[model samples]
Target chain A: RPRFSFSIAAREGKARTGTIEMKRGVIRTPAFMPVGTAATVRATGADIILGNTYHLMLRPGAERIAKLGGLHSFMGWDRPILTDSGGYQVMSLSSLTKQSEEGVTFKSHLDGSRHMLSPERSIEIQHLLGSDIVMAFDECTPYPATPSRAASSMERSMRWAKRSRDAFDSRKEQAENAALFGIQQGSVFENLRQQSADALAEIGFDGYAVGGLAVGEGQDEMFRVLDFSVPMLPDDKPHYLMGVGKPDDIVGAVERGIDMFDCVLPTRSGRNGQAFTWDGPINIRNARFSEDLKPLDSECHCAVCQKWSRAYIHHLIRAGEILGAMLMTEHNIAFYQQLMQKIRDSISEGRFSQFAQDFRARYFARNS
Target chain B: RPRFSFSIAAREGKARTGTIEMKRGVIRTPAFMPVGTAATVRATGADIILGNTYHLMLRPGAERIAKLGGLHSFMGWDRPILTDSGGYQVMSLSSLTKQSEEGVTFKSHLDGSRHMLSPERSIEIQHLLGSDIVMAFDECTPYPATPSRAASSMERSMRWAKRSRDAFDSRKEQAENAALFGIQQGSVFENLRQQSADALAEIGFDGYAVGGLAVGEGQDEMFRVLDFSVPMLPDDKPHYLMGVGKPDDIVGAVERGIDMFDCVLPTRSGRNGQAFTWDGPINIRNARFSEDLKPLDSECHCAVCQKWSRAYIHHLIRAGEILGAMLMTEHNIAFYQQLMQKIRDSISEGRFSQFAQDFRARYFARNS
Candidate 1:
C-alpha cells in the first residue's frame, strides 16, 4: 500500500487537470466523492459506492467492521475509501455536542449514546475501518463567527493537525496506501485563511483542504476567498474543497484550483426528488410533468436516461417507487461524473474559460 | 397483441407443466402473473407484472391509457399480461356497488363517481388495454352462501362468459392475439363447480379459472374444492386458480393440476416487511433480526440478497426507506419465479411428488 501522490497534468488559469495516484486506484481530477455515509450509498450497490467512517462508527461501530473483515468486506464495497475524521458529523450533531481542547464529546445522533472524538481516536477508528484517504481531525469553524473566534478554532485545529499526523504515522496501514489530509479552516476572513493555510503547509500533509466555506457562504463569497487562499496553499499536493456544491459552485471552485470535492447534495437531493441534469434541475413531483414523456436530460447517457422516460420517472416518484430514487441518484452521480470529465477535458485543452462561460449560460438559465 | 394459448405438456399426481404462447413472449408452465394494479406493480418494475381491467378502470382510467398507448406501452412492460374483468373489484367495493342482470354498477373506489361494468364493456376495456390473455367477466362467488345463491352467480357468469367471448371476437386485436379465459365460480359446492366449468367449456374459452375459492375459505377447504374442480375443468385447457395463494397453498394448488397462478400475497406481504425464502416466510422487522448480518436467504440468488445483509434490510424497513419494500418485493417476485421454474422442472423430470415433499419438509421446519 502506498499513500496517494498527485501530479498536475495541465493548468489553464486556475482550472487544472491532474492524476491522483492512490494504491487502490487513480482518481482523475476534478473528482466528486459520493457520500456513502451509512456504509452504503442508498439505493446503490457497491459498484457505485465507496465508504465513510463517521456514519458507520456511529451505527455498526468501527471495531465491528474490523471483526467482520474490514469495511471493504463488511459493506461489500472493495474500493478506495476516503474517511472524514468524524469532524463534519460531530460538528453537525449540534445540540448534543461539547468541544474541548483535548477532544469533542457528543451523544450519537443515531443511537444517543455517549462518544468522544480526539485526533488519536479519530485516526484509530478510521484505521480500524480501513480508510484509504484519512482526513485529519479538525473542528469545522461555524459560519458568522467573529474572526478572532475563527482564528482560535483554526489555530487549535493546527495543533490537533500535528497530533493527527503523529497518530497517523504510528499506524502501519496509515503508512501504506492511506494518506492524511490537513483541513485549513478560517471562515470567510482572508488573512485568517492564509494564516491557517500557512500553518498546515508548515506541518506538511499528503493533501490540503479549503474547509468551512461551503457550509453557508454563497458561491461569490466562497470564490473570493478561494482566489487568494488557493494560491497560498501548496501546489504539488491535491487541494480539496470540502462540502462543495451546485454545478456553478463546482465550476468556480475548479477554476480557483480546488481538485477534489464531496457533498451529500447529489445523493440527498436525488432521494428528495431533485435531479441536476445537464440542462438544469428538475423537481420530479411536479404535476405538469405527469404526461411529459421526455428523458430526464437528453445529454445524459446514464442507464436511467438511456432507458426510462420522464413521465415514467414522475409516475414512479408520485407512486412512491424506490426505483425512482435509485434511477435519479444514478443519473445525478453519472451527470456529475460527466461534468467533472468535461471540466477536466476543457482544462487539458486550455479552453476551460469558454467551457465555463457556456456551462454558466446554460446552468443559471431559468425555466430550463 | 396476440391472445395467449396454453397446452398441456405433462402431469404428475395432479401437477402439470406446459407452455402459453402469446404475442409478447412464451410463458413456461405453471406461470405466475405478478399483479400490477393501477399500472404499477407495487414496489417492483416490469420484471414480472400483472394488470387488470378492474383497477385500470378506477385509477388512471382505461381511456387515458388508450389515448396515450395501450397498456403495454402505457406501463412500459412488453410481456404476457393477463387481465381480469371488473367482476372481483366490484364485489370488494360492496358498499358502493349494485349487482344487476346487466352486470354490476358501482361508485368509483378512487373518486366515488358512478360507473357500470358489463361483460361487453369489460371485454372492450381489456381490448383497449390490449391484453394478451382476456378474462371473461365473472363474479367471485361469496363464501358460506346458499348453494342457490352460488349457482345464480355462476349462471350469470356463464351468460356473461358468452357475451365476453362475442365482444372479444369483435375486436381485431382481441380476436387474433388475445385468448379469452372463462371463470369457474361455484363457492365450495362440487356440483356447482362442475356446472360452471361445463358451461364455460360449452361457451368455449382458451382457458378456465377456478375463481371462487381462497376468498376467506380456509386453505384445507380451498384445497378440497381445487382437488375436485381442477380435474372437472377441461384437461386440454389451462386451469387458473385466481387470487388463491400463500407459498404452501400455491404448492398444493400446483399439485392439484393448476397450470396458471396469480396472487397479491407476494407483493403485499413484501411491502409489509415479510420475505418469502425457500425455507419459509420471515418477518424482516422482527426485533430478533437487529444484529443478524446474514443475507435474507443464504440460498437465494436475487440481486437484493446478492448485495445486502439482512441487518441492513431490517434497518431500511425500520427506518421506512422505500428500498426495503422494493428489495423485498424484488426478492419475493424472484422467489416466486424460481418456485415456478422448480415446479416445472420437477413435473418435466417425473419427480414432482419428491420435490413437493422436500419443499414442505424444509419449509415447515422451525427456526433454530
Candidate 2:
C-alpha cells in the first residue's frame, strides 16, 4: 500500500492551496468535509464526510458494517471518509459516561446499551470500517479549565494517543493502507497548545488537527490560538480545524494556515429553515419572503437557485415539508464547496488577504 | 384556452391505451399519478401528483399559493396536476367533520382552526391553485354500508356533483381551460353503481372516476364493482380509478377500461422499507438481505438500482436515514411509470390480456 502524502502548490500570507493524495482519491486543500453523524450526510451529497465512531458503534455496530463490506460500500459513498475517535461523542452524547485511566464506559443514548471505548478499541473500530483517515483518540479539553486541570487532561490525551498509535501499528498491513491524524487539544492556553502539538509531532502522524478551540471560545480567541499554535505543527503535513464553523470563521482559519475543516452549521441550520448565502444567512420563514419570486441567491448556480423561487421555499418551510430541508441543505453544501474553491483560487493568485477582507465584508454587512 | 380532450389510440379486448391532451401537457393513459399530499410528492419527482384540497386550503392556503404564482411554479412541477375535492381527506383526516345538506364543517387537523367546505368552495379552491384536472366534490362511501345507507350517500353526492359543476362553470375562462371529473360512488351494489354512474353522466363532465371501491373491499369484490360500474361511463372520456391499488389491482382495473390511477402505496411503502420488484414486493429490513450485494432489482434500471445495492439500502433503512426513503421512493415511482409504459405498449399491440395474465402470475406468486 502507498503511504498518504500532502503537497503544497501555492502560498499567500499563511494560506496555501494544495492537495492530499490518498488511495481513494485526491482531496484539494482548504477543503471542507461535511459532518455525516450516522454514515449519511444529512440532506446533501458529500464526497468526503466526517463520521462519528460513537454513533456507528452504537446503531449499525462496526462489526456488522465490516461483515456487510465496509463503510464506503455500505453507505453508497465510494469516496474518502475520515472517522473521528469515539472520544468526542462519548463525552457529549452519553449522559452516563465515566472517564478513567484506561478509557471511558457509557450507556448508549439510543437504547441504554452499555459500551466501553478505549484508544485501542477506537483504532480497531476505524480499521474495521476501512476508514481512509482515522483520528487518534483524545480527550477534548473543556473550556474554562484551570491550568492544572488542563495540563492533566492534555497529558492523558498524549498517553491515549500513544496507545491509539500502538494499536494501529499492530495491524501493520492495514496501518500502511490508511492515514491517521493526531489532534491537538489544550483549551485556550498557548503553552499547553505547544506541549500538545509537540507530543503529537514526536509520535508522528500523517496529518495534524487543531481541536477543542471551537467548543465555546469566540472566533477571535479561536483564531488567536491558531495564530500561535498552527505554526508549531509540521509545515509539510495537512492541518485540519475540527468542528469549525461559519463562513467567516473558515476564512480566518484559512488565513492562519488551517487547510481542512468539518462542521454541521450549514446542514443543521438549513433543516431549520436557515439558508447561507454569499451575503449572509437568512431565515426563509420571514413574512417578507411570502411573495418574493427571487431565488435564494442570485450568485448561486445550484439547481435549487436556478429553478426554484424563494417564495416556494418559504411555503414549503411553513408547511414543514422535507423537500424544503433537502433543497436548502443541498444549496448550503454547494455554497460551502464554492467558497472553498474561491479560497483556493485566491491563495493561488497570492491575494488571500484581499479575498478574506472582501468575503467578511459582504458576509457580515447584511446581517450587521 | 383550448378545452381538454382524450382520445383512444388502440384497444385490445376491453383494455385500451390512449392520451389526454391538456393545455399544460399530454398525459398517456394507464398512467399512475403519485400522491403529493402537501404540495410535495414524498421523496419522488412527480410530473403529475394528486393534491388534497383540504390540506392546501388549511396550510399555506389557496390564496397564498395563487399569490405566489400557482401550484405548478410553487412546487416546481410544470407538467400536469389533478387535485381532489377534499371530501375524502375531510372525512378521513379531520376528527370532527360534521356532514350536512349544504356542506361539511371541520376543525383543522393542523391547528384546531375551523373551516367549512362545500362543492362550490372545493371547486373554487382548485381553480385558485390552477389545477389541470378538478375533481367534483363527492362523498366517498364507506365500505360495508347497507344498501339503503349507500343509496342515500350516493344520492347526496350526485346533488353535490351538480353544485361542483355549476360553481366551476361560473368561472367561464377557468372552466374553459381546465377539465372537471365527476366521481361515481357506490358501495359494491350494482343497482346503486348504475344509479351513481347515470347521475354523473346526466351532469355531463369531461371525465369519470370510479371511487369507493378500494376502501376495504377484497380484490374480487372491487373487480365485481368495476365489471358493472366502468361499462356505464362514457367510453369517449377518461375513466379514473381513485386510490386503486397494488400492481395486480392496477392491471386488473386497466383491463376493465380504467385509464388513470393515484395512490400512496408506492411512496409510503418505500419509506417503510418495502420495495416493489417484478417478482413481488420485499421488505428490505429482513436479515436475509443484510449482506446481499445485488441491486434492489436486477431487471430494473433506475439510478438507485443501477448505482446502489440492496446491502447499502438495508443499512440505510436500518439506520433510519432519509436517503433510504428518497432513493426507494424514487425507484418505486420509476418502477410504476415503467409498468404503465409496458401496459400501454401491450394494449397498443393487441396483447394486453396476455400481458395481464403473465404479470399477475409473476407478481402474486411469491406473496401468495
Best by lDDT: 2
Docking class of 2: incorrect
Q: Residues A1-368, candidate 1, lDDT per residue (tens digit)?
A: 34577889999987779888777767788888775533322221222234556556645688888888877776566667788887765555444467888988864322234578999999999888887888889988878779888989888888889999999999776776688899998888988888888889888999999888777778888889899889988988899898898988899999899999887677877878888976688888887766665778877766677666677567666644456787788888878877888888999998999999999888768354
User: Lowest lDDT 10-mer window, candidate 2 chain A?
Assistant: A37-46
* DockQ of every candidate structure: 0.03, 0.03
What does the TM-score come to for chain B in model 1?
Answer: 0.93
Runs off by more than 4 Å, candidate 2: A1-368, B37-47, B108-112
Q: What local lDDT does model 1 show for residue B38?
A: 36
Predictions: Cα RMSD each: 13.8, 14.7
Q: State how far residue B112 of model 2 sits from its true place (Å).
A: 7.5
lDDT of 1 at B6: 70
